[PDB]
Amino acid sequence: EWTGDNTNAYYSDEVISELHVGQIDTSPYFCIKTVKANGSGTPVVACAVSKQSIWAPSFKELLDQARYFYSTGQSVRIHVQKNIWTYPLFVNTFSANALVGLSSCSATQCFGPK
Amino acid sequence: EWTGDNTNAYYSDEVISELHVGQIDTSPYFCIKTVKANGSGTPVVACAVSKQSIWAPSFKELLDQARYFYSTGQSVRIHVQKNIWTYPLFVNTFSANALVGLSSCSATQCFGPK
Amino acid sequence: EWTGDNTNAYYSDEVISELHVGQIDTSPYFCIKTVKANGSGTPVVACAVSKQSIWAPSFKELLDQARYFYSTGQSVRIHVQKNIWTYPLFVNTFSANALVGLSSCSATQCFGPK
Amino acid sequence: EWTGDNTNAYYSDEVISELHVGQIDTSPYFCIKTVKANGSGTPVVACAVSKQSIWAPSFKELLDQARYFYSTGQSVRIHVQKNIWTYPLFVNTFSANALVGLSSCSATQCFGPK
Amino acid sequence: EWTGDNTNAYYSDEVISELHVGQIDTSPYFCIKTVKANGSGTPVVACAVSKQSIWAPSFKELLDQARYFYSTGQSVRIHVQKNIWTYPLFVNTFSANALVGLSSCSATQCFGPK
Ligand SMILES: CC(=O)N[C@@H]1[C@@H](O)[C@H](O[C@@H]2O[C@H](CO[C@]3(C(=O)O)C[C@H](O)[C@@H](NC(C)=O)[C@H]([C@H](O)[C@H](O)CO)O3)[C@H](O)[C@H](O)[C@H]2O)[C@@H](CO)O[C@H]1O
Ligand SMILES: CC(=O)N[C@@H]1[C@@H](O)[C@H](O[C@@H]2O[C@H](CO[C@]3(C(=O)O)C[C@H](O)[C@@H](NC(C)=O)[C@H]([C@H](O)[C@H](O)CO)O3)[C@H](O)[C@H](O)[C@H]2O)[C@@H](CO)O[C@H]1O
Ligand SMILES: CC(=O)N[C@@H]1[C@@H](O)[C@H](O[C@@H]2O[C@H](CO[C@]3(C(=O)O)C[C@H](O)[C@@H](NC(C)=O)[C@H]([C@H](O)[C@H](O)CO)O3)[C@H](O)[C@H](O)[C@H]2O)[C@@H](CO)O[C@H]1O
């Protein structure tokens, strides 16, 4: 598996606008909300859950990087895999998207799988 | 268990106003005090104890997130579970509330369960 | 044991004015020097030593917390246990106090045991 | 092996201009893009993969250092080992360069092997 | 062993002016360069290697503290042990000094062994 698999989805020119940390079924987790930097479109919500899903190994790296990009407010590309979380109240509050990568979008293009 | 269980309690539009770190019964712990962003009402005190309670797995994530939100002073929703800690002098000093989640808040909503 | 045990000592409204990191007898350690925000009294010195004393579990907290309060210069309550370190040259340079807790302060109180 | 081996390659006076975090084959990874501080030449891309290559042990140290230099915009020397990564879609997105060191640069000389 | 042993060497009123991270013989390492705050004298270079020397246990604490004092530019006392590293190309690039301690310095004194 790879962040850049064509079976994943991504959204460019986004800003991380909200951050939540909690625990579910023995696992610390976090969720982020992102919105287009220019104010268009619909928010993207994605979560990472420790020790859950194939993306578990990168939980700490993604939490650290989400915090970093949240603090700068810079434009980013957010990479997700859809339909991963199944806990129904959790999905309704947040989403079923697993967070699988984060890329800066400084220069003339976003720096990540395209 | 989940941060968002309705048997937990939460308080919206708060700011983390105080932070304490210590040790009890061989466990590092920390506590936070929050107040309404507008200054009204009564403070909320909540603690996390590293190897105690069902929320022990999230100790480091919550410590790191509390420190971040304390440093920015931004508005948050604090999620707690009541009546968890029972060390008598500890409860007098702080509270019996376990910290179980932290959500960033905009002017109109908070990014977390309600 | 507890940070708040009445057999420990504490000093309120102090500023962490100096910070030192080293190693002794296989253990990383750090020490801090604190002074009253108003300049009265005499400075307090306390150290935490990795894998040494009953307070060893909280070494990495405390170190991270001391660094933060050192960086802001804010007024804190420092909690110590006296007469813990016995290495004579070390005590002469620093002190025998073990650092056991750190609490932020407001204009009227500090957020910690007293 | 050593960062400074003459079988590695290095580029002086570069600014870290992009950062990406993801996962591949159960391993967190990150990539950076750097450009000459004066704008000349072509960008350097290098990645570190936490579970892969002889450089795996330094993954966290390099990620933390890359994040710091990215945040300051200071000029650095980037040390790489060429032709390490082999997944074609990964190499085409990023590069085959393994990141093996990062050095600050004085106004006249970079602080690392050359 | 102790940072403050008189068989170690120290240098007061220095500023950490350069920072390098790399890997050697499966071990992450870092090096710093320091110069007198007042611009006089000869620079001091010292390194820490995660898996090597009697000072290995303090690698992470010294890395974090070196990064902190590097970021603030404040004046420090650097404590080293001479003639530790032996790989000739490494020593020629950097030095044989092992980093064994870092102390903050006021105008009058430094908070560390002397
Ligand atoms: C690829 C596609 O579905 N539609 C094409 C447009 O995307 C494209 O117009 C450009 O769109 C750019 C944004 O492209 C992405 C992105 O954010 O990187 C590509 C993503 O694959 C896509 N993600 C998903 C799940 O579909 C994503 C998403 O649709 C939006 O982000 C949601 O708001 O868009 C960018 O905005 C360019 O400025 C814009 O020109 C063109 C190709 O040139 O044709 C469309 O069919
Ligand atoms: C064919 C050839 O060998 N050409 C070289 C010169 O073009 C070049 O000129 C000097 O370059 C200096 C910078 O030196 C490095 C550096 O960045 O530190 C040395 C690196 O080994 C090299 N990296 C490689 C080959 O992978 C790197 C790179 O080649 C470019 O210079 C940077 O994009 O340059 C410095 O800028 C001087 O001002 C300049 O005169 C040097 C560099 O090797 O010597 C010739 O070999
Ligand atoms: C040739 C010689 O050794 N001269 C000595 C003087 O440098 C010195 O004068 C005072 O030095 C003060 C700084 O003292 C230290 C320091 O940095 O804390 C003491 C250290 O032990 C020494 N470290 C060594 C030798 O490894 C260190 C070092 O020499 C300098 O930092 C290098 O620049 O100096 C301070 O600068 C005073 O302003 C000055 O009066 C004294 C004591 O060393 O007499 C001579 O021995």
DSSP per-residue letters across E5-56: -TTSEEEEEEEEEEEEEEEETTEEEEEEEEEETTS-S--EEEEEETTSSTTG
Confirm if A18 and A33 have CB atoms less than 8 A apart: yes
Distance of CA E70 to the CA centre of its chain: 11
Residue of B15, B18, B19, B20 to mutate for C, most C C-beta atoms under 10 A = B20
Confirm if C49 and C29 have CB atoms less than 8 A apart: yes
d(CA B20, CA C73): 16
> How many of the other CB atoms lie within 10 Å of CB of E42?
8
C-alpha atoms less than 13 angstroms from C-alpha of C1 in its C-beta half-sphere: 18
Residue in B86, B83, B76 with CA at minimum distance from that of residue B110:
B76
Tokens of A48: 């990472």
d(CA D83, CA D61): 22
Place of tokens 């004393």: C53
Confirm if C12 and C74 have CB atoms less than 8 A apart: no
Instruction: Report the gap between the CA of B51 and the closest CA in chain C (Å).
Output: 11
Confirm if B104 and B68 have CB atoms less than 8 A apart: no
Collapse the DSSP code of E59 into the 3-class scheme (helix H, G, I; strand E, B; otherwise coil) and give the result.
helix
Tokens of B57: 């797995």
Confirm if B49 and B56 have CB atoms less than 8 A apart: yes
Are A23 and B65 an interchain contact pair (Cβ–Cβ within 8 Å)? no
CATH of domain C1-114: 2.40.50.110
The values of phi and psi at residue D67, to 5°, are: -60, -40
Residue in E2, E6, E71 with CA at minimum distance from that of residue E32:
E71
Are E61 and C87 an interchain contact pair (Cβ–Cβ within 8 Å)? no
d(CA C60, CA B66): 16
Confirm if E48 and E98 have CB atoms less than 8 A apart: yes
- A85-94 own/partner pairs: CB under 8 Å, 24+ apart: A85/A47, A85/A49, A85/A53, A87/A24, A87/A25, A87/B2, A89/B2, A89/B4, A89/B113, A90/A24, A90/A47, A90/B2, A90/B4, A93/B4, A93/B112, A93/B113, A94/A20, A94/A31, A94/A45, A94/A47
Residue E44 vs residues A89, C33, E79, E81: alpha-carbon distances, Å: 59, 26, 10, 12
d(CA E33, CA B8): 52
The values of phi and psi at residue D54, to 5°, are: -65, -15
Residues 6+ apart with CB under 8 A from B110: B12, B13, B76, B77, B103, B104
Q: Is E109 in the pocket of ligand 3 (CB under 6 A)?
A: no
d(CA C67, CA C32): 9
- Are chains A and B in touch, 3+ Cβ pairs below 8 Å? yes
Q: Is E69 in the pocket of ligand 3 (CB under 6 A)?
A: no
d(CA B21, CA E114): 31
In single-letter form, the type of residue at position D96 comes to: A
Residue in D22, D15, D2 with CA at minimum distance from that of residue D90:
D22
3-state secondary structure chain A: CECCCCCCEEEEEEEEEEEEEEEECCEEEEEEEEEECCCCCCCEEEEEECCCCCCHHHHHHHHHHHHHHHHHCCCEEEEEECCCCCCHHHHHHCCCCEEEEEEECCCCCCCCCC
Instruction: Report the gap between the CA of B17 and the closest CA in chain C (Å).
Output: 9
d(CA B16, CA B76): 8
Q: For the residues of D35-82, what is the DSSP string, one character each? A: EETTS-S--EEEEEETTSSTTGGGHHHHHHHHHHHHHH---EEEEEES
Bridge partners for B11 per DSSP: B78
Residues 6+ apart with CB under 8 A from C93: E4, E112, E113, E114
DSSP H/E element including B90: helix B88-93
Q: Is E11 in the pocket of ligand 3 (CB under 6 A)?
A: yes
Q: Is E82 in the pocket of ligand 3 (CB under 6 A)?
A: no
B-chain CB neighbours of C10 within 8 Å are none
Residue B112 vs residues A56, B79, D17: alpha-carbon distances, Å: 21, 9, 33
Q: For the residues of chain C, what is the DSSP string, one character each? A: -BTT-TTSEEEEEEEEEEEEEEEETTEEEEEEEEEETTS-S--EEEEEETT-STTGGGSHHHHHHHHHHHHH--EEEEEEESS----HHHHHHS-SPEEEEEEEB-SS-BSS--
The values of phi and psi at residue B6, to 5°, are: -75, -5
Residues 6+ apart with CB under 8 A from C79: B22, C3, C4, C8, C9, C10, C99, C100, C101, C102, C103, C112, C113
Residues 6+ apart with CB under 8 A from A92: none
Are D90 and A58 an interchain contact pair (Cβ–Cβ within 8 Å)? no
Bridge partners for C46 per DSSP: C32
Distance of CA A69 to the CA centre of its chain: 11
Distance of CA D107 to the CA centre of its chain: 21
Confirm if E98 and E105 have CB atoms less than 8 A apart: no
A-chain CB neighbours of D95 within 8 Å are none
Residues 6+ apart with CB under 8 A from E22: D2, D3, D4, D58, D79, D100, D101, D102, D112, E28, E29, E30
In single-letter form, the type of residue at position E91 comes to: V
D-chain CB neighbours of E20 within 8 Å are 101-104, 111-112
Measured CA angle at E57 (ends E54, E62), to 5 deg:
105
d(CA E84, CA D13): 30
Bridge partners for B19 per DSSP: B32
Confirm if A33 and A17 have CB atoms less than 8 A apart: yes
State how beta strands D76-81 and C98-104 pair.
unpaired
Distance of CA B31 to the CA centre of its chain: 7
d(CA B20, CA C113): 10
Size of interface D-E (CB pairs under 8 A): 69
Residue in D64, D58, D47, C23 with CA at minimum distance from that of residue E49:
D58
The values of phi and psi at residue C90, to 5°, are: -65, -45
Residue in C110, C100, C103, C108 with CA at minimum distance from that of residue C6:
C100
Intra-chain end-to-end CA distance of chain C, in Å: 15
Residue in D44, D52, D43 with CA at minimum distance from that of residue D87:
D52
d(CA E38, CA A62): 42
